[PDB]
């Protein structure tokens, strides 16, 4: 069972008055644990999972100081990007940053990432080796030269392979009761008659954790994609996920169809029949 820790940062400029709207969120796998919102009253990195509330005032002061420096970096980046792209002060623009680390089943370093977008387009990303940069355009190429000269990749590689992994291992232990628990999908099938000759079979997966899952339909033991509809996995709002897959079938032939469920919480894939 692989694990990840990721942080997501969004800054949106507010033309006309004041500093950008800055939102930062932290995740361990599919569980949000921290947040910072510049529009909020506290002006603190805030807890969003019970297991992070175990952290003392030193943790919260440290995360708050760092997150505020992240907000100021993005405010400066929005100004810099506006100049690189020769844009006016009239429009609102967005900078997004995402970084973090993945650990494998051994809770040891597997992958590190640090990427940036401007107005929803790739700008600059640290490559898989954590040694080089992918600059999407000439504006990003200028940032790449600056960061190579200042040995940014090396300092990032140290956090990504080191610090990031140590925090994840700590969070995984402290939040064991939920973070290390897998919630297998609760499955069922619904049937809806469209007409006297056509029916819809819907296969539901509910209350599962992690969000990663596969729902497939088979007809007579063979994979069926034609006449199938699959919704995007969605949050239930209690920390679990939901998904469904439907197939349109000729009325009376429902028994040829089987729904197949794959999930980390299931030792063996599940088969459902009407």
């Amino acid at each position: 069972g692989s694990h990840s820790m990721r942080y997501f940062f969004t800054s949106v400029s507010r033309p006309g008055r004041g500093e950008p709207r800055f939102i930062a969120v932290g995740y361990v796998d599919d569980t949000q644990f921290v947040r910072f919102d510049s529009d909020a009253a506290s002006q603190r990195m805030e807890p969003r999972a019970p297991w992070i509330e175990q952290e003392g005032p030193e943790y919260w002061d440290g995360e708050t100081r760092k997150v505020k420096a992240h907000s100021q970096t993005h405010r400066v980046d929005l100004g810099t990007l506006r100049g690189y792209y020769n844009q006016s002060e009239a429009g609102s623009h967005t900078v997004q940053r995402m970084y973090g680390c993945d650990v494998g089943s051994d809770w040891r370093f597997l992958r590190g990432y640090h990427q940036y977008a401007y107005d929803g387009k790739d700008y600059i990303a640290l490559k898989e080796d954590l040694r080089s940069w992918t600059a999407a355009d000439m504006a990003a190429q200028t940032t790449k030269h600056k960061w190579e000269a200042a040995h940014v990749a090396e300092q990032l590689r140290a956090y990504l392979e080191g610090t990031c992994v140590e925090w994840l291992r700590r969070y995984l232990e402290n939040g064991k009761e939920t973070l290390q628990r897998t919630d297998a999908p609760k499955t069922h099938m619904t049937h809806h008659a469209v007409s006297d000759h056509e029916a819809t079979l819907r296969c539901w997966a509910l209350s599962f954790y992690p969000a990663e899952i596969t729902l497939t339909w088979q007809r007579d033991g063979e994979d069926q994609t034609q006449d199938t509809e699959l919704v995007e996995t969605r949050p239930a709002g209690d920390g679990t996920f939901q998904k469904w897959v439907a197939v349109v079938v000729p009325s009376g032939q429902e028994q040829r169809y089987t729904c197949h469920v794959q999930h980390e919480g299931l030792p063996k894939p599940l088969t459902l029949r009407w």
Binding site: Y7, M45, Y59, Q72, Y123, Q155, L156, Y159
Partner: peptide, 9 residues
């Protein structure tokens, strides 16, 4: 825990 070193673009 977040990155302690932020670099401008």
């Amino acid at each position: 825990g977040i990155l302690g070193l932020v670099f401008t673009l």
